[model samples]
Target: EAEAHCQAPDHFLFAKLKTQTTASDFPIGTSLKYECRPEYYGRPFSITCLDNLVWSSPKDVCKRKSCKTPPDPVNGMVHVITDIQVGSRITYSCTTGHRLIGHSSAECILSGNTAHWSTKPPICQRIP
Candidate 1:
């Protein structure tokens, strides 16, 4: 027979949190406290150890609120069509009779809990 299966180390959306106490064998429903690093937003948070031998899902443990609205390119507008949270994606395109340039799209990137556009977007320049 196999021994008692313990959970894995709690993984975080912002993995740079400072954990006060954590363990692989934490009791089910056991809550753990953590703090996000600087340059990252959010506050001390908790998540209960759940599911079978896993630190099961809990919403927004240390994940910060939405990233500030992404940048907009002139002539061509940017479409930040998503939850706009960490790791989300955004798209951009040229306007009528305009040409596309630069990055046509970019992903919302997360650094700890901080979110920002990862790449530049395209511009709708007038046709030559």
Candidate 2:
């Protein structure tokens, strides 16, 4: 009897994780292990080739990474223009008696695979 050999597993982030190994055929009992991408957070998981030429299902949820709350300038405040997740935007404003220094807005961007703010928080100084 011919042993069961399944094709390469492509159910999950097979193309997203650049460090995973790959092959054309996986024999029965072969396992593929992987972790969440840089901009995601989740438990590690694996898929195994079964006797029926099928890969096992992995039960895991990878949540999108979010940037921490941006710091508020001493004499200014911050406003969320959108959700804090990737692709979001934020604006900064100085108090009535203060002036803003640097960028007045920022964006949540994907740096390589990790999520980060596009720029540091702006500073607020007293208006002489």
Candidate 3:
């Protein structure tokens, strides 16, 4: 009559809990979320996960955005399209005595990683 339940050296009444953990035991109030892609930009970019899980700073890569391929006035003669990317589709001509005015053709896309040229950058006057 002395065996009601006398195995209490470390106790284990009815244990069976392990819902799944792998992110380094992520148990200090976890949180994480970030995103950036589209025209691109900068400034912390994106981050969120306060308290301790840590992850509120690591997203910023998009700073170039260039657009300048139109410079050849006076006896003009410009034309560049070296296998560009990002929507590629540029076209600017002006050699035979020049006569273009503005935006002869443009397409390229992107705007933060360099690759913009949809207009503004066309000048060629030489027919006087």
lDDT of 1 by residue, 1-128 (tens): 54444465556645454555445565566556666654446577666566576555556545444567655677777776765666677788777888878877788776654566787666778999
Which segments of model 1 are wrong by more than 4 Å?
Answer: 1-32, 36-40, 46-62, 112-114
How far residue 99's Cα lies from its native spot in candidate 3, in Å, is 8.4
- lDDT per residue as tens, model 3, 1-119: 32222111221112222233344333333332223344433322323344444444443343323355445555555455664345555676767875778767767676565657666
Error of 1 at 100 (Å): 2.3
Q: Which RMSD does model 3 reach against the true structure?
A: 16.4
Pick the lDDT winner. 2
Please, what is the TM-score per model? 0.53, 0.56, 0.29
Candidate 3 residue 85 Cα shift, in angstroms, is: 16
Cα TM-score of candidate 2: 0.56
Q: If the candidates were sorted by their TM-score against the true structure, best first, what order would they fall in?
A: 2, 1, 3
lDDT of 2 by residue, 1-128 (tens): 65668877775652253335656787788667677776667656667787788888766456667888887789888899767776788888998988899997888877866789998898988877
For candidate 3, what is the total of clashing residue pairs? 1
lDDT winner, 1 or 3: 1
Top TM-score hit: 2
Residue pairs with clashing backbones, model 1? none
Clashes of 2: 0
